[PDB]
Amino acid sequence: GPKFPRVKNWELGSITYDTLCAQSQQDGPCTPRRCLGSLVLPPAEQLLSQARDFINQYYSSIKRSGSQAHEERLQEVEAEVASTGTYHLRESELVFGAKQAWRNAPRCVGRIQWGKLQVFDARDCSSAQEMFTYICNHIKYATNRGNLRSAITVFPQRAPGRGDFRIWNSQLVRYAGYRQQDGSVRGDPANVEITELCIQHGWTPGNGRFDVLPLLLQAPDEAPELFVLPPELVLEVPLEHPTLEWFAALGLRWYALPAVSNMLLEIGGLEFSAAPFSGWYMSTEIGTRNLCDPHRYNILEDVAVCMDLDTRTTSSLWKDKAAVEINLAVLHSFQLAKVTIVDHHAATVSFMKHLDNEQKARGGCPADWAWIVPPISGSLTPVFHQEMVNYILSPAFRYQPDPW
Amino acid sequence: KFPRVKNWELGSITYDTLCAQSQQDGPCTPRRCLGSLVLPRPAEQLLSQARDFINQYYSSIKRSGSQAHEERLQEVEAEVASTGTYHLRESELVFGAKQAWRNAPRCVGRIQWGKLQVFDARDCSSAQEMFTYICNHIKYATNRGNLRSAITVFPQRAPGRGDFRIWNSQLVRYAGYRQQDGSVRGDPANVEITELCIQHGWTPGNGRFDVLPLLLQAPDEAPELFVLPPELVLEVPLEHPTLEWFAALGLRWYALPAVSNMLLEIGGLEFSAAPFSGWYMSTEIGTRNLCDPHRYNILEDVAVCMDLDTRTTSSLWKDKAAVEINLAVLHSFQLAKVTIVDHHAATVSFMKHLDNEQKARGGCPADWAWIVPPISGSLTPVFHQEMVNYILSPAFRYQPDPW
Numbered sequence A: 001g002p003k004f005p006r007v008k009n010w011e012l013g014s015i016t017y018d019t020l021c022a023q024s025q026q027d028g029p030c031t032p033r034r035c036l037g038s039l040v041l042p043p044a045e046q047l048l049s050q051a052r053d054f055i056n057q058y059y060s061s062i063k064r065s066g067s068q069a070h071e072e073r074l075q076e077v078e079a080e081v082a083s084t085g086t087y088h089l090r091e092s093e094l095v096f097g098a099k100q101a102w103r104n105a106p107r108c109v110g111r112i113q114w115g116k117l118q119v120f121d122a123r124d125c126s127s128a129q130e131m132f133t134y135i136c137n138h139i140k141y142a143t144n145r146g147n148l149r150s151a152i153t154v155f156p157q158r159a160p161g162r163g164d165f166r167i168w169n170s171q172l173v174r175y176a177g178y179r180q181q182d183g184s185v186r187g188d189p190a191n192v193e194i195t196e197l198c199i200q201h202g203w204t205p206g207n208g209r210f211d212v213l214p215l216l217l218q219a220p221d222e223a224p225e226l227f228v229l230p231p232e233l234v235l236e237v238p239l240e241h242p243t244l245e246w247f248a249a250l251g252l253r254w255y256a257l258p259a260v261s262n263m264l265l266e267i268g269g270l271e272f273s274a275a276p277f278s279g280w281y282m283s284t285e286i287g288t289r290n291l292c293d294p295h296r297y298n299i300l301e302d303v304a305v306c307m308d309l310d311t312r313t314t315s316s317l318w319k320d321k322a323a324v325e326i327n328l329a330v331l332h333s334f335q336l337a338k339v340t341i342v343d344h345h346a347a348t349v350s351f352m353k354h355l356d357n358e359q360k361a362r363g364g365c366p367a368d369w370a371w372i373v374p375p376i377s378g379s380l381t382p383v384f385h386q387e388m389v390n391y392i393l394s395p396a397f398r399y400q401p402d403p404w
Numbered sequence B: 001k002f003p004r005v006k007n008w009e010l011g012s013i014t015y016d017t018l019c020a021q022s023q024q025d026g027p028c029t030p031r032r033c034l035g036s037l038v039l040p041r042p043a044e045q046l047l048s049q050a051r052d053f054i055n056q057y058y059s060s061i062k063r064s065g066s067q068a069h070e071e072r073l074q075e076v077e078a079e080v081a082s083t084g085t086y087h088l089r090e091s092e093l094v095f096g097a098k099q100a101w102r103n104a105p106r107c108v109g110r111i112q113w114g115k116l117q118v119f120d121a122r123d124c125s126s127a128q129e130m131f132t133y134i135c136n137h138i139k140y141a142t143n144r145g146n147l148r149s150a151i152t153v154f155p156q157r158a159p160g161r162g163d164f165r166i167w168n169s170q171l172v173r174y175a176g177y178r179q180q181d182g183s184v185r186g187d188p189a190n191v192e193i194t195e196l197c198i199q200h201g202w203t204p205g206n207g208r209f210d211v212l213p214l215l216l217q218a219p220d221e222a223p224e225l226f227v228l229p230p231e232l233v234l235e236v237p238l239e240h241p242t243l244e245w246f247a248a249l250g251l252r253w254y255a256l257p258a259v260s261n262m263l264l265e266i267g268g269l270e271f272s273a274a275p276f277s278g279w280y281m282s283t284e285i286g287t288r289n290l291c292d293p294h295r296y297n298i299l300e301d302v303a304v305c306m307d308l309d310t311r312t313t314s315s316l317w318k319d320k321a322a323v324e325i326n327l328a329v330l331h332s333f334q335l336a337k338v339t340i341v342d343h344h345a346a347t348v349s350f351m352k353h354l355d356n357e358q359k360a361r362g363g364c365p366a367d368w369a370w371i372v373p374p375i376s377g378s379l380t381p382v383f384h385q386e387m388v389n390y391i392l393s394p395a396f397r398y399q400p401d402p403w
């Protein structure tokens, strides 16, 4: 019947149609000839159209579409672009835009929380020292002694001619990755490059598996400066297992706060190259991805030998048995330490509730199935059985090239 | 133009150039990706698909441009021009069936694609004969637990008449009986087909694992009911290597996964009945068939027998019970000497397949959402492998249910 993507839930046998994808102004990587959905990373005229669109979104969100204030804001922006080549967001537009960006993020399973986001305006920042202060305040507010709070700090937008504000680190908290003379890596292999960049920039390196990286912070047209986080601001959780007593002896830990700092926040044509945001972890991110990926800490075989599993054959499911206990330990230790965490079952359930909310609110919800489905116990969570439509809406969080 | 495909565990990059041979559109557009949807929403044509297929065949035997190649193009051309259609030689059919398997983006088992026994059943005139061919298929494929991939191909669709159809989705399925109080005894996926068998005069049982009769339809006739000789249906009792109470659950599954509702398309010809079988990957039985909420849904029961904390999600009881169920399946098949493959071995061999196919064809169509197993996804190498999905012909396709 209806000329929109038909979406089915296979568990519940229920059908919806996604009408929201109609508002997509940007094309993704797919064509009728081939699907590329599994790939991880696939001007006044243009600015004004993008800005007009966002102001329309904004005034709709406050139910004043067509109003006098709506049309004056429209003229205010058009004139401003016509004199400076760019424009500025009012504070409340920025708060709306940052929330809409999160709400729009197809790969985030935690979007039920999208309306609860503290937005810190840091668009007055003028130095790297000042960026450090804002970041520290963010970590403090967001960490909140374990009772984690979603937040984003927004630094000054891209300016014509001028250089960008950039945070070189991919997250505000990351473990060092030290390449060894025998080819291997101590710490996190995901962070080898940034570790080497820190060292070249004056950092004295440690030699632990869990050394916290300093921040490399870049103000416009200046070389990045190096800032060490004071340890007390970085909440870490030592990992133990509820029944396997030896697990604590492994000496594994993880940081409380997932704080992504390398993404670009795009709102109404304006690009915020530095706008770090944080939430809380889903257990599988730490337990399965960071600790068990072969190209990460890769501790699966280690745990399995302690569990006395037959690691000589795939068919013992030793990988699965070990991964479950690691995830259980992440969950148990965070709960024990009273630090906010969510398991992949609770997260996915809450995401289905989000899909139902957005279905009523907006006629659909952009979602990237491969990313939404958790990396262990896939078909055990309800999102596995949920068809999803993927597309790009704006405001948006976007990937950006590394500054170097 | 050509997609840059990356493996994120190894850092390596390939470029898929095979996708340029796709002549059939998928469900995605630049505006939106629909890759997670399970099902889809004359003479000039047939002749071009026929030429293209004949070209693939003679290219496969390294005989392109030869005399036999040329004469075979003229036969097909002459037959279509006169009759609106044509027929495949048995050799072409064998090649076509193998290519369809090779091209199936959702199949993790494709390392095996060149080892496929093809039965020509195109001389079938009745439901009775379909039943004979099917019994032979199962006997061959089962082979006392040493499973061998097979396909049996029934007469192609024809302009005038109805299709040969097997109404069952697989040759071997368990009944699903809808109880008065809404709930279902047996396999809920098969409530509809189980009802159809009953209406057509089948005496139903009341078990959780009652093997269904086959509903076979010869063109433009009512389907007929045939009961599979119980000795033809190898089943495996499920037990656990260390949990002795597990066998007490009376769990079982059949040996032979034999899909019978899909359409085989070769060179423009369509074969509406063409059941095929290989062997199970353990997670199909353990995770999806037994643990899915809309199937046998045994997770909570098993979790209670392990004395797990069902009260909360954060105890990962579901994850724990699922692993022991998959282990039970592997153990039980290995103990009954019935071919099976775990999802780790399967995915490892699919990576080998991708590498072979990269050298052979310049790519490999793959549906990531289907290739990554339903438990322990990122613990397998395919998870970290970018994949390109597209449609090549010959191909297996879905088709409407004949009722």
Ligand code: HEM
Pocket (backbone or CB within 6 Å): A098, A102, A105, A107, A108, A109, A110, A111, A113, A117, A150, A151, A152, A277, A278, A279, A280, A281, A282, A285, A289, A342, A347, A371, A397
């Ligand atoms: C509040 C708790 C939150 C949870 C549980 C959560 C959960 C997740 C998870 C599990 C992923 C998958 C990432 C991976 O496996 O690498 C993800 C991706 C993502 N999240 Fe959320 N998130 C939360 C808060 C936030 C916030 C506050 C934002 C932004 C304001 C956000 C934006 C994103 C974006 C943009 C992605 C995609 C990243 C990419 O494409 O690389 N999330 N989220």
Ligand code: HEM
Pocket (backbone or CB within 6 Å): B097, B101, B104, B106, B107, B108, B109, B110, B112, B116, B149, B150, B151, B276, B277, B278, B279, B280, B281, B284, B341, B346, B370, B396
């Ligand atoms: C030899 C052992 C084989 C294994 C281990 C295997 C494995 C699998 C698995 C695990 C799936 C996903 C099925 C599901 O989740 O329901 C699948 C799908 C599929 N397989 Fe294979 N397979 C084998 C042989 C074959 C053969 C012989 C053929 C055809 C000649 C074939 C054709 C297909 C097709 C067309 C699909 C997609 C089914 C659909 O879209 O519903 N497979 N396979």
Ligand SMILES: CNCCc1cccc(OCc2ccc3ccc(N)nc3c2)c1
Pocket (backbone or CB within 6 Å): A110, A170, A171, A258, A260, A278, A279, A280, A281, A282, A285
């Ligand atoms: C290897 N991933 C490529 C992109 C990338 C790189 C570095 C970090 C990264 O994190 C994704 C991400 C973003 C936001 C999150 C918010 C909360 C949360 N629990 N996880 C979150 C995870 C994503």
Ligand SMILES: CNCCc1cccc(OCc2ccc3ccc(N)nc3c2)c1
Pocket (backbone or CB within 6 Å): B109, B169, B170, B257, B259, B261, B277, B278, B279, B280, B281, B284
């Ligand atoms: C529910 N999936 C869509 C249609 C459908 C209907 C009934 C059965 C079915 O099985 C998929 C399928 C196909 C071929 C297979 C080959 C081997 C194997 N082990 N499993 C296989 C599984 C597929």
Ligand SMILES: C[C@H](O)[C@H](O)[C@H]1CNc2nc(N)[nH]c(=O)c2N1
Pocket (backbone or CB within 6 Å): A038, A039, A040, A370, A371, A372, B008, B383, B384, B385, B386, B387
């Ligand atoms: C190749 C594939 O896209 C890649 O491994 C993806 C799969 N799904 C993912 N899902 C999440 N949440 N995070 C990831 O990093 C990935 N990686």
Ligand SMILES: C[C@H](O)[C@H](O)[C@H]1CNc2nc(N)[nH]c(=O)c2N1
Pocket (backbone or CB within 6 Å): A010, A384, A385, A386, A387, A388, B036, B037, B038, B369, B370, B371
């Ligand atoms: C909605 C989603 O596409 C659907 O559940 C898919 C996911 N991946 C799958 N993968 C396999 N092998 N088999 C399936 O039936 C499915 N189902």
Ligand SMILES: [Zn+2]
Pocket (backbone or CB within 6 Å): A030, A034, A035, A036, A037, B028, B032, B033, B034, B035
């Ligand atoms: Zn797609």
